[PDB]
Structures are given as structure tokens and as C-alpha cells.
Amino acid sequence: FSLNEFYIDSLKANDAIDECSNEVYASAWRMQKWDIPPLSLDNKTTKDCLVFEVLHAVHNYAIYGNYLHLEEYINKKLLLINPNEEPDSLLFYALAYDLKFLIRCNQSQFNCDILQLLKENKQMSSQLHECFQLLLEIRNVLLSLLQSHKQLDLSDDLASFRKYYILELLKISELIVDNLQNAFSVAMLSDALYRKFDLADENLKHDIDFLSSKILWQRDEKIDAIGMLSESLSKTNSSIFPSISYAYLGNWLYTTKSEKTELVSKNYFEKSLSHMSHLNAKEKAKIYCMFAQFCDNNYSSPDLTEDFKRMEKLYFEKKNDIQQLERLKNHHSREMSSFIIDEREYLRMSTFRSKMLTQSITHYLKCLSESDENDVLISRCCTMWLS
Amino acid sequence: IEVSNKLFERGHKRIAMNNYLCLYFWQVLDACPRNVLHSLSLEIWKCYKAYDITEFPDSLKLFFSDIMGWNFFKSPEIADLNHYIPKTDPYEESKLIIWKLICQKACSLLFKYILLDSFIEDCIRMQELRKFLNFPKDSIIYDSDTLVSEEGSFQWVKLQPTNFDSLSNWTKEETLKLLNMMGKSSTHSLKLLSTYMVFSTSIIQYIIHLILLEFDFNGNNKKQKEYVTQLILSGLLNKNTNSIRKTCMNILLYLRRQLGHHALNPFEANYWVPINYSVAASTAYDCHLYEQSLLFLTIHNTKTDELDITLLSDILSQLPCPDAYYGIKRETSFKNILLKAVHEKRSPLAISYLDAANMYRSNGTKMMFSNTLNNAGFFSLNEFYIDSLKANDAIDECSEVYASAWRMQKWDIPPLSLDNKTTKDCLVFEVLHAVHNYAIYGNYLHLEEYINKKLLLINPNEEPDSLLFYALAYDLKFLIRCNQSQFNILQLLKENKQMSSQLHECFQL
Amino acid sequence: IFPFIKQQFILFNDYSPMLSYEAIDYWKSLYILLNENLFVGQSSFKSVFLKWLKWHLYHLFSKEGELPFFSFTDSSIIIFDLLMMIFYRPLSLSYITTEIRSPFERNLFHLKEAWPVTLRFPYTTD
Amino acid sequence: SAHKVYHPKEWSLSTCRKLIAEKQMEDLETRLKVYDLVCRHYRPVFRHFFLESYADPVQWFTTQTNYARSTAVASVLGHVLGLGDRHGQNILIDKTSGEVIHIDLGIAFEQGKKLPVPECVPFRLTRDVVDGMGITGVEGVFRRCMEFTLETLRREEDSLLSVLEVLRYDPLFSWLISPLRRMKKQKMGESEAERAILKVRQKLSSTLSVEASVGELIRIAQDPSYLALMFCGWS
């Protein structure tokens, strides 16, 4: 959006864009530049010109701290939208109502969290292109306009509401606004606001770090996300019991092999399981079941299981050779030392294989039990069970 | 050809004199035939800046630039050897070696420098033979080394009043206050009475290492040892001049290189003079000798294991080696990702994306963004960004701003001043705007004269990319004055079929 | 600032003959020697301004006294010749030996009083 | 001799190996703790070879960088080709430039894994060799050079794979090395060609990105848990 804004004012310098169009205001309301004059209320407007006019009204009613003239503006806007029967009008209606709740309620100014609207279907719900667009960005700019003037803040708990972009970004990334770069941009904004507003050691910092690491890893710069989540998780944090972040970082570490298998299993998944029983929800099943996925990837590796089979073979043939030689006594002693070392290694690796397979089957069963959303894995569990 | 190749198999570094170079092989070479010039050995132009071009006629400099572009275009000579001669010289024999070095330097000054030369002759005449006269040729020993006690240089009023001292008179004062502990030869007059010639730091810096080596373990005890320690420490940290710090670091390294008598380790020999190497390394980093700064940093970390992590990052940021910036990992935040992606200039994990996010989240950047856009190749995006910055005035610079002035073919941006030394981007823009204007209007002599004027001033800077402009001057001249077949640009690489380890310096724009 | 002045100039109002002589000569020297830009910098913008001066605010000086930017001065002809020869030509200045014959009056008013220079050398000084 | 000169207080190079070799039938944690103790006694002294013993700082940095590049390229090529023994004796650093040349490449193509004590580390990166490129560990020059070597070796997978194939059909190249032979080197019926070439394809397989791949390689080369099991002495 910033490169887009650069392009627009560059075009304005060339006097070519005729800055009363939709794209100029689509840049304006997204870059929070409340200096370009809004389009006339009597004159017909597109979606983005309307959104920018409404947001300029919100800005000038938040600088001077009002909840009533904003109502007049919103209602005068909503009066003159429907008769043309534009398909997007319904969306505008939603916007108006959401705005109404941001300047009425003295606490928890948002309705239904929007992210739950996408979580209830447990997918993107694939309504259609025109049914999923542009709401979350206006919610973001509204929320940041709430505390544009500290005379409109007048409290500290709002500055903790300020920092709940995590819902907005779990919504935009997984995709009402239909993008990913905006998710990273708002995550950067949330990090800046956390380092700007309040104490730099809390749990909100860790949650923001976790969301940013998710946004980065999905962009596939895997090692950078690994580092950013491990800087805040593997740390003497405040009230550090985050199970979801621990499970996600363990899965990522085993994905890119950036950490040892035993170390990641003992430091990033057992920590998550120890801090369980306080998030009994769908995320709980997600944690056991990402754990089962990681343990299955541990078991299902082709190369290491090939060496495992060769190792079972040489263990059995060394047992046979011990039987043959027991029937060169010093040679027998050296051989028995060598293959007792081999045998103890065999027991260690076989016990590890049994433990990982049983644990992954059990956590697959749990991933099914706690949440019915993830179902297909039972077949996978079946393949890992009746084999 | 034989003259050219025999000129270089040995060291014949003696054309350093500026008045003696236009007489030397830079005015005779111009008159030599062009085919012969092409047939000359490559080492003539291998060291394009080692020659002192202080005194040169305009035409000679123009011919130098033309031939230098011609020689760059075929078999580029950017690659150079790294190492020079060492400093370690090899108990009475050690003192003999120090005195031998001092007297060899004195004889060299005598040969090179008439009043001053006569004074050095008298100073060398100042009587006892310590076998050190064998190394100088015996003719000087017989003539000026029974001999007349009366000085043959000055007549009690002819002596110089010891003026015109160097800006590095700091070493002169140090040598004066140092040698006044046990005077072997009143070599004292070489520093206090012969300090006339701006010698005033040449011989002083030449044998200050030697006299400091003499002072160390000169006797069982010596306050002058604490004096050398204090003066080294005082010279390392300094103000208003980097040259004094450079000289002090040179003495530090010279003393560190020497073999320490009855020294258990070369390590502790590097610490014969008690000092903290961390402040020395910080000074070297401020002295812009980054490899020397890293040497001091690693010697300090070998002693104290107390490296300055921020200092190490600052050092590795500017290190010329391409595979730097990754030695020290900075724990990742939304500023480390951006800075790491800027250096690579890569499209995956787009630095354009991170810069775009930070430009609106408000989480140095006014140039990093422009350079990332230019390096990625989105020249129109960088044009838009530069125009937006100019509209906001936030850039307020004539650097970046001119990188996209010629690349985007916008010939309305005024050029930078021709007199001032200017960066390669403004350099290229000046040349290219000139050629565009004289293509529009068609005056060939004007373009030639302008390129000559612009190529005359570039030489003294000792900038790494001066030869790169010599190439551009020769190239556009060839592509301009010809009536047909304007090419002269790819064929070299087609023969190479690869970069041929040319490094970013040789091949760029 | 030069582009802003040029935009203000050639507007028939700011572009006036009231400007002192040789100011345009200095501008041309700056544009063709140091800047050395002729793409709307020399022979295009300077030529346009000179043509506007020769057409607008022509033969009507702001002040009649001292021949300010008047046609009586040969310096105007010298500047015109210099500008004509500076339009992308080798030795673009092409100007030498103006033959002032001491009409320039380099020494200022009270030049006889300036010739204080009689006692230039102080007693036992310098 | 550098460790016997710079730090005479610590244990000699023959003082620690013997006790490292003393534990041969023990668990992994015992080896890890003994290696931690030994590497704490022996500080890395290689970095002094380049410094104040070669030349002025420009040459010192040039030879340190060239040593880093040469050891990175040699290490990547050893991993891709499965190079085996990497003794200190079997690496030669050129006093003129510092680059490392690997002599005695008689054990390669997984043969090193067949030794009585398998070389679990891909390429030797013990504490001294890591110190060699300076105060920095295996980061900067080393990691980037390894990345570039792996990327280029994967770009030319077809031609290099064909070359290794023509070695496979060559009857002289015995992709099989006798176990007794293998034993000797450390002391100082299936066609193995197809399995070895499959391993080489896997080491050049682009399933895992090159950056994280060389990161994992560096991790195994530096993690003391692996290095404590490499071999008795071997350092």
C-alpha cells in the first residue's frame, strides 16, 4: 500500500490521475492521510471514496471526542446508499453498524470479533469474492483512530485493546481482505505500538511475536520466523506457559531441521503439554494434533527408517553370529563387546521408535476426539495403527 | 617490448616523484606508436593509481585516460596482489640490525635530498666504526665517514632554523623527548636540527619504530618505557587529525611484528608494550582500516575474550568481503530482517515488501528503500519513490536521487557540479546527460571537451571506481566519433562466457 | 531555485529589462560551464528568456539613466555574441579582447581617493 | 606446536585424546560431558596462525577469508561426495595463501560411515578449525560460501550425476571398501554404486531449502553431541 501511495502522489505530480477517483481514496484511507479533501456527500461515490469520507468523519470526531455528530454523519451516509441497489451496499451497512458499536460501548467496542465469523465455518467458507473484502482494514484504521488523540484515549485498558490486532490478523491471513502482505504490515504496526505504548515485558508481547512468526513462516522465510518466535519463547518470559507457540515452533523446527529431534521434543513440545489444561478448546486439539503430525514426520522419514531397517537386520545377524561363535575366545570377547554396544544402541533406537509411534497414534486419536473438524486423520491414524 | 617487460620484472617504484614522472615513462609512452602501446606489457596499467599524477599536463592526463579505458576494455586489471614485504627485521646483533636500518635510511635520504643533502652528509660524518659501515658501499666510507672535524654543510649562519615541519610533527616531538635518554649520535640533529624538510615525519616515522624497539629492554629499568607506553596510548586516541592515529597504529603494528627477546609467545610479544587492543581497534575502525581493526579486535579477544559485540557488528557492516554481515547474528526483529534483506537485494522474501510494510507502520530508510528498489531492478518503482520523497522533501539529497535520473532517461534533472568530486551515480548522470544533449544538438567537439574536463578532475581522489569512468569515457568516445559500427561491451564477456571472478567492482552498470 | 525563477520569468511580468546587465551572461555561464546543461538549460530556456527580453520589455527600460539594459551599450552586443557562440560550439565562450579602452571604470567612486594606496606600505611593517 | 607455545598451561594435545579414547563403551552423555571438559581445558588456538605470524592486516584478512572459502567449498564437496577421513594431517593449508587442500581421498561415498566408530559429523568443524576464520565462528564467510557451493552443485545436478555415473560403470572405482581396510584408515553383493548415487541425489535433493540445509549441516558439524562421538583423537 505504501508503494501504491507513492505511485498515486507521483501521478498527482504529473496531473494525470485527476484525484477524485476511487484509487486515490483507496490509498488515502489505507495510509491514514486525513488531508486529502473527502468527496462530496451529495455526489455519488464508489466503495472506497465512501469509506474514506466516513473515516475522515471518524477522525474529526475522535480528535474532538464526540459520539453524537458521528452518528449524524453515519446515518446521513446510510440514508442515501440503497436505492441504486448496488451489490456492495450490504457490506457498507455492516461497516456502519460496526462503526456504531466502536463509538457507543465504553468497553469491548467490537461485535462478533469478525475472526469468529470465519472460524465458525472452520475454513475460508468461500462465500464469493464480493462477499469477502475490505472490512478488516476499516476495522483496523478505526481502532487506531480511537486512540489517535490521547484525549480520545483517556484510559490505559484501551491501549491494551489497541494491541488486539492478533484477531484482525488471524482473520486477514486465514482472508477477508484477500491478501497476506497487509497481515505482515499490521503485525509490524502492532510490534511498533507495543514497543511504543506500554511495558515491554508481558504476555501480549509474546502473543504478538507468535502471530508475527506465523505470518512470516507462511511467507516461507522459514528461518527468520523460527528465530523471531524462539527469541520470545525460549526466554525467561513473564508468566511463560504458552503451549500453542511451543507446539508451533516445535513443528517448524522439525520442518526445517533447524534443531535436534530430541532437543525439540524435550524443549518445545513437552513444554506445551505441561502447560495444557488451561486452553480446553479447538486450539487444544490443534496442539496435540500438530504434535502428532510432527511425531509422524519423525516416524515416516524414509531415509532414517531405511537405516533403521538395516540396523534391525544387523542386530539380528549379530545375534545369530553370537549364537554361532558361542557354540578365538579373545576374538569372541572383542566381538561381544562390539555387539553389546550395537545391541544397546538397538534397544535405544527401537524404544525411541515405539515411543514416537505410540505417542503419535494417541495424539491423532486426541486430535479427532477434542475437535470433530479434523477427521481424515483417523484414516491416517488407521494406517499408522493396523499396520 | 623488451624495455616494457624488463621495466617490471624488477623494482624500477622510483618514479614516485611528480616532477620526474612527466619526464619519465608517461610522456614518452604517449608518443610511442599505438600498436606498440597495445603490445606493451600489462603491468604498465596494472597499478592505475600507484603512479603519482600530481604534476601532469592536461594533454598527458587525457592520453592517460584514453589508454586506460582502452586497456580496461581488454583483459581487465582490477585484480591485484594483496601482500607486501614484511616488517620483522631478522643481544648485540639486534642493536646492530637497528643501527644498520637507521644508517641505510640516512644514506637513502642523503642520495635523494643541496643544503639539506650537505647537512645529511655532515650528520653521517658524525665517527666511530661499529662494523655498520660495511653494509653501505665503501666509497662513502672513504669519502664521508683523519676526516675533517669541521662541518662541511653550514657556516654558523647557513644552518636551517628548523621550520616547515610536517603535520605529523607529533612523531618529531616524541622522538625528540625519547632520544634524549642516551645520545649515541647528536642522529639527534636529524630530528631536531634537520627537521626542515616535511623528513619532518619521513625519517621520524621511518626510525621511530626502530628507536622504540631500541628502548624496550634497553636497560634493566627505564622510565622511558613508561614514556613510550603513555605516548602510544595518547596517540591511539586523538582529535582533529586521523594521520596521528594512523601513525600510532603503524608504530603499534611495527613493534608487535618484531621478535621479542626471551619472549615465550609471539602472542605476548604482540603485548610487549602494555595497551588495551580494544580501543586501538575502535580507533582503527574510525581510521577506516577495517582489516586492521579486525586484527586488533581478534588479538584483544585472544587476550581478554572481551570483544565489543556492537563494535564487531559495526566492523562487519563495512567489510569489503562479500560474505560478511553474517558473521554475527543479530537476534531477529522487524529491523534485522529488513537490514539483512537490503544487503542481498533479493526478490524472494522481498525487501520491497518489508520496506513497504515499514513505510506505513513507521517501525537510513530513505536511502535503503531506494537502493533496494534500484538493486531489485524496478527502476520505475524507484522513480516513483524518489519523486514522492522529493515532494515530501524528506530525501533532500542530490546523491539515490540521481541514480534514477539517468536510468529512467529523465533529462530534466539538473546535473551536479562538475568541479566537485561526485559519486559514481552523479558521475554517470553528468556524462549521460551531456551525451544526450549533444546528441540532440550535435556538437562533437563540445562533448569531447566536456568529457575531458570531467575526466581530468577524477584522478586525484584515489577513488576505487576512477578506472570505471575512464572506461565509460573511452567507450562513449568510441561509440560517438565513429561514423558506423558503433559497438566496442559484450564480446569480452562472450569470450569469458562468465563473470570470470571480475567482482562487483569490474562489472556494474 | 533557478527553475522557479525561470518559471516566474518568461511570464511577461517577472521577465523584465530592469534586470542589471551581465546577469544573463552570468546565468548562461553557470548553465553552460558548471552545469553545462542545455536540455531546457541552455539555448532552449536561456534562449527563450533572451527572446522574451528582446520582445517583451524591449526598448522600454525601467530606469532611463545610466543606460540600464539599454541598446546604447555595446556590452549588450557582446553578451548577445557570447550567447550566440555558446550554443553548443567548440570554445563556446569564443570571447576575448573586448577592447574596453578604460570605459568599464573598474575602480569605484573616489578612485583618486583610493589611489590611500599611495601610503600602501606602512612604516616598518609587512 | 601452536597450542604448546601460546598456552603452555593447558593440557597438551596428547593429554586429552587418551582420556577421550578411554571411554569407548559408554553412553552419549558421558562423551558429551568429557568433550565439554576437554574443550574447556583446550582453548581454540588456530586463530593465531594467521594473525601476527603471516603479514600486515590486509594479507592476514585475505588469507583468513581464503581459508574460510576453501574450507567451506571443500566441506560442501566432501558432504555431497560423502568424503570420509578429515584428519588434521589430511588437510594442508598453504602458507602462501591459507587455502586448504584435501589429500588422501581414499575413503569416500559413505565409506567413512562404515568405520568402527562412524564419522557422524559430515565435515570436520571442531573448535580450532572454527576459530581459524577468526573471532567469528562458522558464520559469515563460511556459511555463505557453503550456501553458494550447495546451490551451484544443485544447479549442475545432471552433469555431475552423469560424471559419478561414469565412475559407477568404471570397473576400477571400487565403490566398496573392505571393512578391515576401513578400520586401518581410522587407526592412522549388492551394487553399491546405485545406492551411493541415490544418496548423492538425496544430498542434492531440493526438498529442503539450501539455506536451512547448510544450517543443519553447520549444526551437526558444531553441536558437541555429535562431535563427542566422531572418533578417539581425530583432532
Numbering used by the authors:
A (entry chain A): 1876 to 2049, 2052 to 2204, 2218 to 2277
B (entry chain B): 1474 to 1485, 1488 to 1565, 1573 to 1595, 1597 to 1609, 1617 to 1635, 1638 to 1678, 1680 to 1691, 1693 to 1857, ...
C (entry chain B): 537 to 651, 653 to 663
D (entry chain B): 2546 to 2733, 2763 to 2809
Original authors' sentences:
ATM/Tel1 kinase functions as an obligate homodimer with a highly dynamic N-terminal helical solenoid domain responsible for ligand binding and a conserved C-terminal FAT/kinase/FATC domain6.
After incubating the active wild-type ATM/Tel1 with the CHK2 substrate peptide (CHK263–74), and AMP-PNP in vitro, we froze the specimen and determined the cryo-EM reconstruction, which revealed that ATM/Tel1 adopts three distinct conformations. We focused on analyzing Structure 2 of the active state that binds to the substrate peptide, with a resolution of 3.6 Å. Unexpectedly, only one monomer in the active dimer binds to the substrate peptide. The glutamine (Gln69) sits in a hydrophobic pocket formed by the activation loop and the FATC domain, where it stacks against Phe2805 (FATC) and forms a pair of hydrogen bonds with the backbone of Val2662 (activation loop). However, the Lys2730 of the kα9b in the PIKK regulatory domain (PRD) of Mono2 occupies the Thr68-binding site, and Gln2731 occupies the Gln69-binding site, thereby competitively preventing substrate binding in the catalytic center. In contrast, in the active state of Mono2, only kα9c is disordered, while kα9b remains in place, blocking access to the substrate-binding site.
